Amino acid sequence: DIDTAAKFIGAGAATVGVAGSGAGIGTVFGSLIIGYARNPSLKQQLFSYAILGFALSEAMGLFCLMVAFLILFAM
Amino acid sequence: DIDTAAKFIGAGAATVGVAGSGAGIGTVFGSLIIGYARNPSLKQQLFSYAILGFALSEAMGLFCLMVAFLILFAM
Amino acid sequence: DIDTAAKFIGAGAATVGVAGSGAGIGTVFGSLIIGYARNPSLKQQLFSYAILGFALSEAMGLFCLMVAFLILFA
Amino acid sequence: DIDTAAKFIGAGAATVGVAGSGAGIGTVFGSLIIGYARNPSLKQQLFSYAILGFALSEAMGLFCLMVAFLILFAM
Amino acid sequence: DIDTAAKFIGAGAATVGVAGSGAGIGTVFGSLIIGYARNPSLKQQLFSYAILGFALSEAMGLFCLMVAFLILFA
Amino acid sequence: DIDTAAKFIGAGAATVGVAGSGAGIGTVFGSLIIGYARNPSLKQQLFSYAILGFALSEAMGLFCLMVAFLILFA
Amino acid sequence: DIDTAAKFIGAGAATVGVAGSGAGIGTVFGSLIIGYARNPSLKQQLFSYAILGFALSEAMGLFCLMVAFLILFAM
Amino acid sequence: DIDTAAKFIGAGAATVGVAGSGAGIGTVFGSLIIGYARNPSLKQQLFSYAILGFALSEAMGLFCLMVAFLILFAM
Amino acid sequence: VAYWRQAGLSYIRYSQICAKAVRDALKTEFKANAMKTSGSTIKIVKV
Amino acid sequence: FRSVISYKTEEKPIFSLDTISSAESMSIYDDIDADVLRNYQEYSLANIIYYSLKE
Amino acid sequence: MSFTFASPTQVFFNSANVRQVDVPTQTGAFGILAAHVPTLQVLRPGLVVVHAEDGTTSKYFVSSGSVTVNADSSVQLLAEEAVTLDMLDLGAAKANLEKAQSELLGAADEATRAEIQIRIEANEALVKALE
């Protein structure tokens, strides 16, 4: 069914959002490596903020992915 | 059915864009991490303007997402 | 329609460019965080720089979406 | 018809390229913030090089917009 | 069937997501180089957190991969 | 036929994802340069982590190209 | 004319690739900013290297740009 | 025929992977700049690495370009 | 390479001038012990 | 000086910028541009001289 | 962290333990905690607000010197002129800043210009310190 072809095309096109999340998270944890290296005795605070940033980047990532998934099955 | 498919395709091509804002969010939060590693005495200011950068990039992410939904549902 | 379906495709495609503007904005503000945690004795000038950069990059992403919304209905 | 459809597709996939220029200017101004924070004794030279970077980066970005514009208006 | 062609199109488009994980790994390992150069005496824990980040970016890469084959091979 | 066109689309899209792996190689190597300038007395370990990061980025790139060559020729 | 459609769509897809050129020129200019600030003494050599990177990415952008130009003129 | 256009559509989609190559080259030739600015006494080794990275990333860029031109002319 | 370095002023000159400045901002209530313990006295004899 | 009756002669080392910015020993120290060593040594010279003067 | 903050005349902290330090430097201020990466930064006219292990944080103005963050987590903060804040006249600091600017032009040489700029910068950092 052509509409199902659109379904598949749109899902595959909009699952690319994970790209930005991957790049941003890579940057985040690299900065975490640097920051903990410079000042090792703030490792706990640095990882608190690192987990904040991780969660709140993957949040938008999987938000887009979940919107596209609802597009996929249960529109 | 051609326009029905084009709507979902354009919706995907619009929901992709927020990946860049996700990368920017990762950048700014890693920047918070290392800036707090260097100068922990500015915790308050650092966090308060890191969250501002977060919301400010969320602005552009919402910008693309709303564009996508507008095209998909209301032309 | 063929032509209108392509209109929609072109709009959705054009409105992707915003990714670069958003990432660049994130870079500008992370850099403000860094350069301010370093030297907090120029706060005013640092905010001047960062806001000017935000306006600039946001504006360029908005030009991309301007192409999107003019191809939409023009 | 497909000529007009081709024009719309081309504009949509062409005006994209300015995202790279956006990332470029973001990096340029981040390095500007860093460079100023280092040596406020060079502010004028920093401004000169930064506006030069903006000019010679938005110039790079604008070509995809110009290509789409030429395709649309005058084919 | 044509819908299988659509599956191919979607999977090809999805496979672009791999780029995010690739760039993330690049920058994470670059920051590990930096953090092992500036402060060699944290090598251990720095590498631990670097592999953590590698895992959580390969997460995006592999989830894009798996979804590409799920839409292609549901 | 339409599946041939779908396979062409599959190649054209799936290969793009390698941009992230290329950029990650670029960033990890720039980090090599920075670290080596900072701590020249670790040259060997710098190459070690450099080749490690390159392998872990070519993983993603070769997944991209494998998906391309499997949609197209298989 | 599906031939013209392919020409224009291909040109529009090729011109995007200069996103890498934009990001590269931006990061090179920012790197030059940082380098001049930290070590103003080697201004000349750093600027020469920056121009070299500028051009060496502009050529890679011109690759796709000339592909599009050739499509526009010949094919 | 559609496939006489699908070949070029796929090739134009393929060529865009060169954005990663461009961004990587710019990043490496900015790292060159700042690395030389910080520690001028290690210039030759810096440049020896820089060429390695440039060649090694434009290699993947040329893999993308070769895929494209193989679709175009050699098959 | 701050501005005073290319001027030729050795870092000791810079520290001297900054210290003198921070001394001039001292209250005359404390300028008593600031002025003493501050001045240099050594003269130089050449070869 | 050690006690009202006790003083022991001592000799302490002064290192130049070339000697100090070309040793693997202090590679670890971070943020050290080739200039901040010039300033730090210019200051440590006066610092050691003042210490010796007081003693 | 074994902190030792001293001046040519007086010693404030001798192998004392304080949690966090906020030092200025020639490349923009920063902070120091127990295991901070070793550094050989020099100082800039500014103020160090040492954070005692407990709540108290004490602010000492310093005019120049050298901060060394040690390999074994200790710290040596030597300052040519380490004065606690109250000993300074903010009005006199601003007046000195203004005068020093006044003689800014009267610098037939570049080195003289740098001299007046040095005093001006120190005076302004003082002015901001006392607020």
Author numbering:
A (entry chain R), B (entry chain Q), D (entry chain O), G (entry chain N), H (entry chain M): 1 to 75
C (entry chain P), E (entry chain K), F (entry chain L): 1 to 74
I (entry chain I): 1 to 47
J (entry chain G): 165 to 219
K (entry chain H): 16 to 146
From the paper:
The dimeric enzyme, inhibited by residues 1 to 60 of regulatory protein IF1, was purified in the presence glycodiosgenin, Brij-35, and phospholipids, and its structure was determined by cryo-EM of single particles. As it rotates, the asymmetrical central stalk brings about structural changes in the three catalytic sites, found mainly in each of the three β-subunits, which alternate with three noncatalytic α-subunits in the spherical extrinsic domain. The inhibition of ATP hydrolysis in the isolated catalytic F1-domain arrests the rotary cycle at the catalytic dwell, and in structures of the inhibited bovine F1-IF1 complex, the rotary cycle has been arrested at 27° to 32° after the pause in the rotary cycle preceding the release of phosphate. Therefore, the rotational angle in the F1-domain is not influenced significantly by interactions with the additional components of the intact enzyme that are absent from the isolated F1-domain. During catalysis, it prevents the dissociation of the α3β3-domain from the central stalk by clamping it in position from above, and it resists the rotational torque of the central stalk, preventing the α3β3-domain and the rest of the stator domain from following the direction of rotation.
Adenosine triphosphate (ATP), the fuel of life, is produced in inner membranes of the mitochondria of eukaryotic cells by an embedded molecular machine with a rotary action, called ATP synthase. This membrane-bound enzyme is a machine that transmits by a rotary action the potential energy of the transmembrane proton motive force, generated by respiration, into the catalytic sites in the extrinsic domain.
